[PDB]
Amino acid sequence: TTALVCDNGSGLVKAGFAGDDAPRAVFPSIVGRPRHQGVMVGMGQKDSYVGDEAQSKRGILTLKYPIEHGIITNWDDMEKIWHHTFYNELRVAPEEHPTLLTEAPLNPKANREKMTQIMFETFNVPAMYVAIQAVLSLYASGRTTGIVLDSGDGVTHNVPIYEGYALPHAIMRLDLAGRDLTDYLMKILTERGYSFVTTAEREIVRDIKEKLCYVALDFENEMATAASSSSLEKSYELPDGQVITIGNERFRCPETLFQPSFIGMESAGIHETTYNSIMKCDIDIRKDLYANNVMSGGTTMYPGIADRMQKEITALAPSTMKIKIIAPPERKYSVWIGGSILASLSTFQQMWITKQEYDEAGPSIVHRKCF
Amino acid sequence: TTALVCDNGSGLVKAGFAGDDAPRAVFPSIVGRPRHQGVMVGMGQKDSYVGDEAQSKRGILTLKYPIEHGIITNWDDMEKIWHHTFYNELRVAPEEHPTLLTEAPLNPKANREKMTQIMFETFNVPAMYVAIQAVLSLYASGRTTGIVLDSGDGVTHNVPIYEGYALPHAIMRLDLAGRDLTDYLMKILTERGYSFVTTAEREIVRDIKEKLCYVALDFENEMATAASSSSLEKSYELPDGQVITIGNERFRCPETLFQPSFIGMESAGIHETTYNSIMKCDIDIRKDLYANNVMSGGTTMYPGIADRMQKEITALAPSTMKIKIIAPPERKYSVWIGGSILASLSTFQQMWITKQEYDEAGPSIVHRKC
Amino acid sequence: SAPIVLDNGTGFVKVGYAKDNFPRFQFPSIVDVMVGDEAELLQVKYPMENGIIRDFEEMNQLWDYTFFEKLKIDPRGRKILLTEPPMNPVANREKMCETMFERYGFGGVYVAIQAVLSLYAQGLSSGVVVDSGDGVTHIVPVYESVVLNHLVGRLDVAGRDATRYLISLLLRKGYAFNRTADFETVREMKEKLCYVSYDLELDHKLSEETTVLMRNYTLPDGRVIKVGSERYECPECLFQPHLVGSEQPGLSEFIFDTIQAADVDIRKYLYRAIVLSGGSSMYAGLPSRLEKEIKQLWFERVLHGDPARLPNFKVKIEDAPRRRHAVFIGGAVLADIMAQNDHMWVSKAEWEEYGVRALDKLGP
């Protein structure tokens, strides 16, 4: 009767049982459909593909991400991914196991209730609870206060908490994530000369981003050095074999996160919005929030992101106020660790919302029993 | 030998000549600056925009409100707004026109000093003076007794007065007029599905709340009947051509005004602070104020706020005391009408702050004369 | 003493002076040297297959022929502006400016973007422009005389690709033009017998049921060929890139997404003003078909099946007979406007110092 969890992030679904230190299914969340009609008989030729199969045979299948910016867009593709996760990777029937879910803040109540309704009416789950993808990272870190900054492939939000009491009026959210960064990277590569417009090429650009992309303290100094010398030009090979070279783009990409004016957005960066959020709270808790701020989720594994954020927040805040960043190496799976811990806890059991409650009260119950 | 008035609101600004009974030039107090560097050459492009021009063309310009909660924070933008409203909308030279200013009750003395110094130096006017929006809103109706509750765009307050003598130990101020309201409306719209984070979207939300949202009487009963019956869902069109439906947000926004807990504060609603201010006053003026309590300000234009306000104040107040709340039309311009009446009064002329006083005792003279 | 205009294109090249409504000269860039109108047999190059340049030496030969045979001026200082795609790699324009500043003076060029050029030509200050050349097409929005620079869109399927697909179709039918020649004849027959299908299903049923729509076209050698569904099909291969082999949404959906990515307050002003440029846009039935496709895409994505308010859309596409030379007209107008001040240009000086970096003065 052990519980499980499945963080269905916009980048990849992390699904795994509870009471474990690491997940099992780390599989990408993409649905691929064959571009052509297909004529082979008896050798695959399926009408759809999901998971690592798409990433493998991506040169033909047109790809689609079902969820974007954390809101779902294709419920059919979403339930197909859920079926593939539950019946192929985990190899378990959810009828005899609960299912903990995850969602970003300030999301459509319609989306949340539709997720709950489909999970209850399609899989016959006994219970189904949701939560934020930040309190779980906090639990995984093992603290009870501080501010948490998640930068998932779909969204980028920051939330403060003090002794377990959240502050909704201080929560901040932005639609900047790895997809806009990959688009800007493709644009600047076309500027260089290399063209990338398809979906498989988008995945290749995302792999390049995950492989070689950093940040620096003095963006102008780095630009000057890259324009003067060539010590930053790094090489990368492709499946075709024709190697390519990339220059200042590797660090010019995250400047979008640090300067959304590059892509066109008018909102401020992560440092400014974090400072604003902290300022929205009370000073007696700001003093501690400045001392322990944690990073989580993808898009923050870049090397040197800690130093840039530290310098920015220190220049924006008084000097006498000490500041310390928390960016461990186990961040890509921090939300899953938090979900597993919460599912393994004892009291949380009483909070599980079962089937009869939904059947008698409808989906609207999820907006009360949960956050 | 005529006069001039210019009420500088946190959200809007209304200026013109005295004597008249209505304002001449009212427009939003904002500044729009182009964010997308690089334009098509030959056609020419301006550096910054102000007034209705920004609101007319804003998809490319980022907007900035130089005033926040009644306090000034962008003196350059304030000077630009003053120049625009003194040279374009009116086309009058202020060197031969004594002007009049407004200011919330409690504000930085340094802010007032900088305002008067700017108005004296950068314009070379004959004289000037400041006042409180409460006194002018009261002069508008003409009554001299009672309490007045003002609520602009970023600042609100309540002030009593009896036979011309004001009680400074009872004035109350809060920062819940329309800005946190617009923010909470954006939040609830995001909760519903529609996203509004930019400045043009902020103006769109301002317009939709000005046109649709309204306060209720029984918050719980209204929420219940709205969740059960879909008779309150109202549609609104956007500049592009889309249509968006809104339900209980129309109640939740004024409810947030009444219960700042939804915004993250611990202060009490307007009714509680009004009753507290009236309590600190003596008993006779308490009685005389319960009867004549006026509400003004743009935020005050919510349909159904007077009835709910009087209901709450009666429920929390003792009986045998008739509470006749008043809220006449065109109240958002009551400050302008009061300022015009004051400038027209002959006696008030002697209270003008001339240029010699400023040149002699500096700008701090504003306090002594106030 | 006025500047010159030269919008070096994919397969064509048009030249005139700083002020001339209709271009004084226009000739294909096909290629002693035969560069020029002598094509009327030596090797055929076609260097600029797309907005990119490959045989820079052949391009230099072509420019020399144009400046010495079609034109009779060889100056050093006479400003001449240029054109290029929006996101053309910097290397191309760098080499272009380098050769035009070394082999000749041409102090001050200020290369620009065919989108804003055609916009100037039409005498507008807002709207979206969709240029459809021979090797590439692009889409550029503008609002109140301001460029976005972040919603610009590129699409590398037009002209040459439709011609190759028509060749493949005629091959499927039996007729083959494998020779390097006859490419111009196929281009002529395409521009002569082609039209978009307002209703694809209707046109398909007509071609399958009726003998009409089948035309007989002669060739320079003397033989005759028959053309059928290909006529109304090649605009579909233009509309459906997946048919050609590229993974892209198309043209109508492309511009729809590009506009939706903008701010709501601008969207309207873009649906009310839409201009085109390039010979590829002269396909019969293209404007109304695009309008209907945009209307259907809106009806589907936004209203989800609510035709009660569809008439309140107010879409107004624009088209004229001068889209073939809109870029040229705009370049001429801009040259006549900027011929007074030399600061906006890039003189032959300040080149050896930071010449390449001077080219960054245009696009931040």
Binding site: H69, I71, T73, D175 | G193, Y194, S195, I244 | Q260, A261
Partner: peptide
């Protein structure tokens, strides 16, 4: 884009 209005 997928917010039924803006974005």
């Amino acid at each position: 884009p997928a917010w039924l209005a803006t974005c």
